[PDB]
mmCIF file of C-alpha atoms in Angstrom:
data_model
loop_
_atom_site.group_PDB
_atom_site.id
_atom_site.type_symbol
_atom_site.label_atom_id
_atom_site.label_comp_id
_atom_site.label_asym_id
_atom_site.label_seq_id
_atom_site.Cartn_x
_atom_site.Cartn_y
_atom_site.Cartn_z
ATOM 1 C CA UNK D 1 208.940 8.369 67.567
ATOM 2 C CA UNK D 2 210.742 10.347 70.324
ATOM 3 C CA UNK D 3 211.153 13.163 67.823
ATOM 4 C CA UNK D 4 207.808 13.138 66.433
ATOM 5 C CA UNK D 5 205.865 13.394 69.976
ATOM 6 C CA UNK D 6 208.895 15.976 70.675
ATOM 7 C CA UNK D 7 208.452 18.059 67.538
ATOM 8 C CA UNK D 8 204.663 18.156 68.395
ATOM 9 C CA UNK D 9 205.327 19.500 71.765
ATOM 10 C CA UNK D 10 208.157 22.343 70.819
ATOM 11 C CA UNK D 11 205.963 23.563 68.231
ATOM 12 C CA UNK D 12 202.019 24.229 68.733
ATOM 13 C CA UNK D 13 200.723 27.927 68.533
ATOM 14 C CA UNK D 14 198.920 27.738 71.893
ATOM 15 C CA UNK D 15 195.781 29.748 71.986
ATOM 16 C CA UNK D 16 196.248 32.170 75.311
ATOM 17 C CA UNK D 17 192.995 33.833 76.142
ATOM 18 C CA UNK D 18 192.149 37.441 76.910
ATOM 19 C CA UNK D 19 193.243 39.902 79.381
ATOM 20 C CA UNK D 20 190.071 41.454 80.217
ATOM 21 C CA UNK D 21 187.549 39.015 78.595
ATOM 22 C CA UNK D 22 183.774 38.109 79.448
ATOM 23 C CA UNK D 23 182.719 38.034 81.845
ATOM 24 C CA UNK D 24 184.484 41.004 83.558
ATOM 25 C CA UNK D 25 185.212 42.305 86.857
ATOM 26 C CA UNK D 26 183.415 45.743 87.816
ATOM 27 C CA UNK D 27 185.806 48.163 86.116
ATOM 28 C CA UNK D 28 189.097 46.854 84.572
ATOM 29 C CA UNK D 29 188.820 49.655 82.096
ATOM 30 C CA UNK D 30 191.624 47.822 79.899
ATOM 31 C CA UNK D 31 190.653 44.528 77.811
ATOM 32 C CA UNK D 32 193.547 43.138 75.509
ATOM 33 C CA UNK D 33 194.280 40.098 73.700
ATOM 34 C CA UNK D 34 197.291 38.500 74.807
ATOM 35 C CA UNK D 35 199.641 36.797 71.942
ATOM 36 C CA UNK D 36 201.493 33.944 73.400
ATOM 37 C CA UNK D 37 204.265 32.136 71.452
ATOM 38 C CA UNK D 38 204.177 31.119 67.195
ATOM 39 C CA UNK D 39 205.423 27.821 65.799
ATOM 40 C CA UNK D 40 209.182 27.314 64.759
ATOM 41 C CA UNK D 41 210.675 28.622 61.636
ATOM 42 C CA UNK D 42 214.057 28.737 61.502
ATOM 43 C CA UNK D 43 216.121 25.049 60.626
ATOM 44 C CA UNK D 44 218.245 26.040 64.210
ATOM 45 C CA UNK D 45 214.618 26.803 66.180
ATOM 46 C CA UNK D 46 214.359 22.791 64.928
ATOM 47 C CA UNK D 47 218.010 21.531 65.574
ATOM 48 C CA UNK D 48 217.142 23.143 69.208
ATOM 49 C CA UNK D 49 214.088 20.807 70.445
ATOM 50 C CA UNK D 50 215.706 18.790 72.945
ATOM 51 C CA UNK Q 1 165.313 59.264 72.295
ATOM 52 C CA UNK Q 2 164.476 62.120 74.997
ATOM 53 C CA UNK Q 3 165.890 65.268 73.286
ATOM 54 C CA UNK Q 4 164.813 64.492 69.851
ATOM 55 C CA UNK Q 5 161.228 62.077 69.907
ATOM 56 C CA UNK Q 6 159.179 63.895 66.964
ATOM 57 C CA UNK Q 7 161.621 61.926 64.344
ATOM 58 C CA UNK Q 8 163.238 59.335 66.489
ATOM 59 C CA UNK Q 9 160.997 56.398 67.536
ATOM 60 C CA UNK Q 10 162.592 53.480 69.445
ATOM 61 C CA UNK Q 11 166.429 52.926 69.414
ATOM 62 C CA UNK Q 12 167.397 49.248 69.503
ATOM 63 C CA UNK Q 13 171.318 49.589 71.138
ATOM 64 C CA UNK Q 14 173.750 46.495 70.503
ATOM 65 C CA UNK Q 15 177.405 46.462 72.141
ATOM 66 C CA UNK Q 16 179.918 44.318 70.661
ATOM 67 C CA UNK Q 17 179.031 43.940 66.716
ATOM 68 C CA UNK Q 18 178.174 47.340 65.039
ATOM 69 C CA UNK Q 19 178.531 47.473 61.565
ATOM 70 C CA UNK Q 20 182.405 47.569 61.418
ATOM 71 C CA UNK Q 21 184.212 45.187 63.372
ATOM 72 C CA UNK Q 22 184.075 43.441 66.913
ATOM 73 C CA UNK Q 23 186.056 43.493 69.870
ATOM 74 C CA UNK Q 24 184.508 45.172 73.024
ATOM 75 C CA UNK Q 25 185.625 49.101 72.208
ATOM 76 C CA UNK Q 26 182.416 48.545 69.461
ATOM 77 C CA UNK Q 27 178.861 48.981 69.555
ATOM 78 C CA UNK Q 28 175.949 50.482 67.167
ATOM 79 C CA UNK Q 29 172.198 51.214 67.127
ATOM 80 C CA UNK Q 30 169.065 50.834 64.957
ATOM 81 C CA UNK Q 31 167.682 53.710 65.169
ATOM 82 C CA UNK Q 32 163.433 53.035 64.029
ATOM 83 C CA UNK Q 33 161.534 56.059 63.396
ATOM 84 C CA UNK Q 34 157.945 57.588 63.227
ATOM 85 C CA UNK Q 35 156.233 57.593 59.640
ATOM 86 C CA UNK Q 36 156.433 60.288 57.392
ATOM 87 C CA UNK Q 37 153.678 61.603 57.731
ATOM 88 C CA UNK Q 38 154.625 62.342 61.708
ATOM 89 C CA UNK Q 39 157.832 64.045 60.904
ATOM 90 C CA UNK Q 40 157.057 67.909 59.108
ATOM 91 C CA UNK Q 41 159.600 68.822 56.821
ATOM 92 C CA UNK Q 42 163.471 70.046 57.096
ATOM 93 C CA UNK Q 43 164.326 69.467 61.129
ATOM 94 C CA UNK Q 44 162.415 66.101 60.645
ATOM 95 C CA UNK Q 45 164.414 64.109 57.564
ATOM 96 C CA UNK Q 46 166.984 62.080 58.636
ATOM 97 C CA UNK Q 47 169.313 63.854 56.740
ATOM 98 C CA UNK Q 48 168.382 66.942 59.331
ATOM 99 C CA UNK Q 49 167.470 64.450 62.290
ATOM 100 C CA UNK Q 50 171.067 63.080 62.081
#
């Protein structure tokens, strides 16, 4: 059950928001989405969440 | 709508979904026009108004 809460935790796409989304601040002139972390995929990526 | 209102009637504007895709670099308009009878030939078909 340690492992299973673990393995949850050390691999969840998280969302991450905008940089430049809406509302807005007069201006900014630059909107981008901003791509946080993926999920594991690799059998070491695995052997690695402490 | 100033420098061309003998076709061109109102001109509903939308920023965000245009026909393509989304994002905030995107934006369209429905352009309404007269009748046909109010638009003389050539300069006046949509074909020549666009």
């Amino acid at each position: 059950g340690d492992v299973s809460s673990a393995i949850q935790a050390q691999n969840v796409q998280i969302s991450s928001g905008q940089l430049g989304g809406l509302p807005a601040v007069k201006g900014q002139q630059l909107n981008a989405t901003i791509i946080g972390k993926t999920r594991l995929q690799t059998a070491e990526q695995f052997e690695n969440i402490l | 709508l100033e420098k061309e209102s003998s076709s061109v009637s109102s001109v509903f504007t939308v920023t965000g979904f245009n026909f393509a895709g989304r994002g905030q670099s995107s934006g369209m308009a429905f352009i309404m026009l007269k009748p046909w009878e109010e638009r003389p030939g050539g300069e006046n078909s949509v074909f020549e108004l666009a």
